Amino acid sequence: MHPRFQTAFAQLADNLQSALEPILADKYFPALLTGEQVSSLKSATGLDEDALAFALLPLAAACARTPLSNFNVGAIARGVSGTWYFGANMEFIGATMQQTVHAEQSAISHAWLSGEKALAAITVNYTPCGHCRQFMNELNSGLDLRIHLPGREAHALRDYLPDAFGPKDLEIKTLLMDEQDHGYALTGDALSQAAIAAANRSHMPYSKSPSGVALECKDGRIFSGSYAENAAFNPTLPPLQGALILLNLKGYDYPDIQRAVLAEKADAPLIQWDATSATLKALGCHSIDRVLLA
Amino acid sequence: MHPRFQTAFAQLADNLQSALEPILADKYFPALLTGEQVSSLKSATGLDEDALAFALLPLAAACARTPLSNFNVGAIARGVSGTWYFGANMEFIGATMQQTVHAEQSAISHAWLSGEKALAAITVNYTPCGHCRQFMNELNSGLDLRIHLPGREAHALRDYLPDAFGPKDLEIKTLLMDEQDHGYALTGDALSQAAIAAANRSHMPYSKSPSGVALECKDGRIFSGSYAENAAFNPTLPPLQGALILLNLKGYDYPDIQRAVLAEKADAPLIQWDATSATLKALGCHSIDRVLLA
Ligand SMILES: [Zn+2]
Ligand SMILES: [Zn+2]
């Protein structure tokens, strides 16, 4: 068990602890549960999906990186595949408030970057902020996505965001998590190729500026992040954050990053380079390169 | 009349055009209307406050800087003083999506930076995004603020943001637009003193990192911006954006900036320096200095 899960696990119900102890054994438990694992968990406890998701939220919140607030939020995104993806909020000392990752964005990005094609529901241990409701309205699930919160009854996103602004208002038909491939040729080494592959999956219908970041860890692990625009612009997930969401959920920590690469167009209306390098230097990484698409 | 207002004005009703033509005569019309001016406008047209506010939204939207979307949004914040403040959205080529200013944030910041102590209502020509509903929930007006949208009936913010997240969740009692003065001594020249004065009005209860930016124009005009945190962190208004909101509403343009100063603490958990310089260099300003508080 990775040390982060240790207090949360200790507080779980006995039959849940038992069913989970095999799964959580590995330090690099991927903060995700396949359909099969969810079925076993249900057989061992008698919990249904929603109640299981709620019971598990302490483990998702245990992945939160909150040096400023000490307010840990956990979210579980439930893929249409049946896979459940954890997500937790992250705050970065030395950067800005605009670089913060919310638990809900972490869980959705985990699912999208893992290749999930659509989400069925999202379970969170605290009500989502307007920034997250706006982020969720970018998805191909639109206003129908169901949110599950402790003590409340389920609701579609349209109930949490009445008279919603979204891609339709800007006449955009390509929604986040729809299949996208921008056809940039992968060149360079492993890390730049991973960054370009991430840029190829970019959701960028508003500025048409593709970008992706890939981080290489001490042990050779590469974590990649694709850029995801939002119709309201500011809730956009920058490329670096995707990679850091993955690095953290998968059990690693910022001192394990060795190199990082950002791929983006040279003549692009929006440029990620400055915010990427500045946040990475804040986290300690200083080996940052940029490969540019054409 | 500043050229931006010229098409919008031409499309206004005749008795409105007549009443406004004196006010809009000056190129540097401050994109604000005092209680007296609103009274005159009502006498000249017979419009009540809400309908007047709607009639005026084309002039507020005429201040929008939208190189990416060409989607102009105008907002009118109505102060408790009776002053109405315009606001419009701004997009910055060469920066990121996180630097975007929404019309609603522009109008609220205009009011706060002008010294308005509380808002009564906000009128917008398009429904506010979740990012803005979250921004509005930081204010001392809380969930009671009334939003007015074309064709809809008025509603308090609590109707647009059900089961809201906000400062109470983080046990914060100091709300935005409450009186704040952090007591930093004003040192240096005019521009650094203006930046420190702006930092002294910072709403920063979450990171305790005060900052302010002041911009000096070719003609000697100084525009200042205070930092305003948000409970959901990301909707935070950075200091530079406050100053650029003011510079643009007041009729100036980015090539008029000569110098800029950012004031902030050296040992602060969050640092504005990198995003401030990078966005200003993108806008063309290259004379940026930083004075630091202690
Ligand atoms: Zn949120
Ligand atoms: Zn908005």
Curated annotation (Swiss-Prot), chains A, B:
UniProt-listed Enzyme Commission number(s): 3.5.4.5
Entry's cofactor comment: Binds 1 zinc ion.
Stored CDD domains: cytidine_deaminase
Annotated active site: 104
Origin superkingdom: Bacteria
GO molecular function annotations of the record: cytidine deaminase activity; identical protein binding; protein homodimerization activity; pyrimidine nucleoside binding; zinc ion binding
InterPro entries: APOBEC/CMP_deaminase_Zn-bd (IPR016192), CMP_dCMP_dom (IPR002125), Cyd/dCyd_deaminase_Zn-bd (IPR013171), Cyt/Deoxycyt_deaminase (IPR050202), Cyt_deam_dimer (IPR006263), Cytidine_deaminase-like (IPR016193), Cytidine_deaminase_bacteria (IPR020797)
UniProt KW keywords: Hydrolase, Metal-binding, Zinc
Cofactor(s) needed for function: Zn(2+)
A GO CC term assigned to this protein in UniProt: cytosol
Binding positions (substrate): 89-91
Class of this enzyme: hydrolase
Catalytic activity, as annotated: cytidine + H2O + H(+) = uridine + NH4(+); 2'-deoxycytidine + H2O + H(+) = 2'-deoxyuridine + NH4(+)
All residue ranges annotated as the CMP/dCMP-type deaminase domain in the record: 48-168, 186-294
GO biological process, alphabetically ordered: cytidine deamination; deoxycytidine catabolic process; nucleobase-containing small molecule interconversion
Record: residues binding Zn(2+): 102, 129, 132
This protein's domain notes: Each monomer is composed of a small N-terminal alpha-helical domain and two larger core domains that have nearly identical tertiary structures and are related by approximate two-fold symmetry, but lack homology.
Quaternary structure, from the entry: Homodimer.
NCBIfam families: cyt_deam_dimer, PRK09027.1
Family per similarity comment: Belongs to the cytidine and deoxycytidylate deaminase family.
PANTHER family hit by this protein: CYTIDINE DEAMINASE
Function: This enzyme scavenges exogenous and endogenous cytidine and 2'-deoxycytidine for UMP synthesis.
Protein name (database record): Cytidine deaminase
